[PDB]
C-alpha cells in the first residue's frame, strides 16, 4: 500500500504529513530519522537513491519532491477542489507560489534554522556572526515578499480559502519559529494568516506536525561519525 | 490579449518561448533586454514588481514563474498530451522534475554561464580558476543526477515522449553550452537525448530560440553604470 518516508524535522515532510492526515489519506508511516543519518544508510538508499525525505512509495511507484507528492495525493485521492482549484488562474496562483518558494522562502527558513540553531547546538560548529546576520536580513526580505507579492489583503496566499500554497508556506515559516526567530512579531497580516491556516488545518494536527521542529533548540550534540557524514549534506542543502 | 515578456538570454524564457511557438499559441512578444538593464526599469516594475522574466499577461491576470506559466498555457490552449500527460504517474514525474530542477540544474547551469563567460566578459570581473572549477564540478554532479534519477535508459526524462521536463532541461543545459563548457561529451546517453529533444522541438525553432545564448561570449562589456545596477542582482541570482 501507500508509504510515506517522513521526518517532521524536515519542512517539506510536515507539508506532506499535514496534507495526508487532514484529508484522511491512508498511508503507512516510515519515520526516517535525519538526526541519526538514517537517510544515508543502505536501507534507505534502496528506497530513494537521492537519500532524501519526503519520499512516497506505492508498489513500484516512487516519488520525491513534496510539490510532486502533494499534487499526486490531490489527484489520486480526489481531495477538495480548494486545495488546487479547477479555475485555471486560481490554479496558476498555487503553482506560482509553489514554484517561487524553492529558491527563496524555503532557502531562507532553512538557513535560519541551521545558522542560528542547528550548526552551533546540533553540529557544534560556530557560525560567523556576519553570515548569521545576512541570513536573518534575507529572511526579512522573503517575509516581506510573502506579504507583498502573495498574501496582500486576502485571507490566504491565493484567495479566500486555504490551498497547497498556504500549507507549504506555514511549514516553512515554522523553521525559523523553531529556531527562536521573531517571525510573526511585528507582522500583523502574517500573524492573522497563521491563525486562519492552523484553524483550517486543525490545531491538534498542526501542533502534532510541529513537535520535533520546536524541540530543535533541545537536541543533544551529534557524535563525530554522524556529523562527518551530515556536514557535506547540510552545506549542500542550504545554499 | 496574451502577452509574453521574454528575453531569449534567460533560460526560463526559452522554455516559455519554445512551448508557445511550437504549440501555435497566439501571443504578442515583448522583448525585455537584460543586457541593457531594461528589466530594472520603472515601467517594467509595473508588470512585475519583482523585475524578473519571464512574465505572462492576459488581461488583469499576470503570472510569473516559468513552471506556472508552462502549466497554465497547457490548460488554457489544450496541447498534445505528452507535455503534461493525463496519466497520473507520468504527470507526477513531470512535476517531480520541474520541482527538482529549481535548486539544482537551474542553479548549476546559471552559475556555469556567469563564472565561465558573463563575469569575465560582460562585467569585467575575473573569476579564480577554483571558483570556475567548483562550479563546473557541481555541474557534473547535477548532470549525473539528471541521468541516474531522471533519464536513465528512456527516450526522454519522463517517458518515451518529450514533456515540459525535457523542454526545461535542454534550455537549462544550453547555458553551459553557450558558455563553451563541456556538457554532452563523455555522456553518450545525454548526447543521444539532446538530438531527440531538438528533433521533437524542431531544429529551426530550437536554433532560433538559442541565437542569443550561443552568442553570449560576444556580448559587449556593460558600461560602469549598467554594471553598478546589475552587480547586486547577479550575485543574488546565482546564490
Curated annotation (Swiss-Prot), chains A, B:
Q: Where in the cell is it found?
A: Cytoplasm
Domain GST N-terminal, by residue range, is 1-81
What this protein is called in its record is Glutathione S-transferase theta-1
Q: What is catalyzed by this enzyme? A: RX + glutathione = an S-substituted glutathione + a halide anion + H(+)
Mind listing the UniProt keywords for this protein, alphabetically? Cytoplasm, Transferase
Q: Which organism is it from?
A: Homo sapiens
Result of changing residue 175 to Q: Increases activity towards alkylhalogenides, but not hydroperoxides
User: This protein's superkingdom?
Assistant: Eukaryota
Its GO biological process annotations read:
glutathione metabolic process
